UniProtKB/Swiss-Prot annotation:
Protein family membership: Belongs to the MDM2/MDM4 family.
Induction per the UniProt record: By DNA damage.
Disorder cited: Seems to be amplified in certain tumors (including soft tissue sarcomas, osteosarcomas and gliomas). A higher frequency of splice variants lacking p53 binding domain sequences was found in late-stage and high-grade ovarian and bladder carcinomas. Four of the splice variants show loss of p53 binding.
Top-level taxonomic group: Eukaryota
Residue segments, region Necessary for interaction with USP2: 1-84
Protein localization: Nucleus, Nucleoplasm; Cytoplasm; Nucleus, Nucleolus; Nucleus
UniProt gene name: MDM2
Residues of the full protein shown: 25 to 108 of 491
Listed name of the protein: E3 ubiquitin-protein ligase Mdm2
Additional free-text comment from the UniProt record: MDM2 RING finger mutations that failed to ubiquitinate p53 in vitro did not target p53 for degradation when expressed in cells.
Domain free text: Region I is sufficient for binding p53 and inhibiting its G1 arrest and apoptosis functions. It also binds p73 and E2F1. Region II contains most of a central acidic region required for interaction with ribosomal protein L5 and a putative C4-type zinc finger. The RING finger domain which coordinates two molecules of zinc interacts specifically with RNA whether or not zinc is present and mediates the heterooligomerization with MDM4. It is also essential for its ubiquitin ligase E3 activity toward p53 and itself.
Length: 84
């Protein structure tokens, strides 16, 4: 139920995929990031689970060049780095 306030860069990213809010549940953040990954085609066509964000704003925000979507605890850390 927790509402979080994204830092400026993550907030702009969320707004790029149609987010209209100031604060978000972690669920909404994950949905919007998933939409971002889909729209920017940061997932690989052939390779399961891996998101390639090295060329992308997302990579700048997360501080990694790639990650697996299976690693939920790591994903939470990467997002929380970008929350107030
Ligand atoms: C209540 C809503 O919850 C979630 C929604 C979404 C995800 C995880 C969630 O919750 C778990 C933390 C993840 C995802 C992973 C990491 C981030 Cl940086 C962003 C989004 N995703 C997603 C993105 C890419 C790929 C290849 C599979 C995905 O998703 C199936 C998948 N996820 N894990 N295995 N398969 C979404 O499109 C939305
Ligand atoms: C109550 C919160 O729980 C946890 C949170 C986190 C982790 C483990 C947890 O609990 C298990 C010990 C682990 C991690 C591993 C060891 C330590 Cl020395 C520090 C952090 N991690 C994490 C860090 C780096 C990498 C490359 C992957 C990670 O994570 C994979 C991963 N594991 N599960 N999903 N993704 C986190 O970013 C947060």
């Amino acid at each position: 139920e927790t509402l979080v306030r994204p830092k400026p860069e993550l907030l702009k990213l969320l707004k790029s995929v149609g987010a209209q809010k100031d604060t978000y549940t972690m669920k909404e953040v994950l949905f919007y990031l998933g939409q971002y990954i889909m729209t920017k085609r940061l997932y690989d066509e052939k390779q399961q689970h891996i998101v390639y964000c090295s060329n992308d704003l997302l990579g700048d925000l997360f501080g990694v060049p790639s990650f697996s979507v299976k690693e939920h605890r790591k994903i939470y850390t990467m997002i929380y780095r970008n929350l107030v």
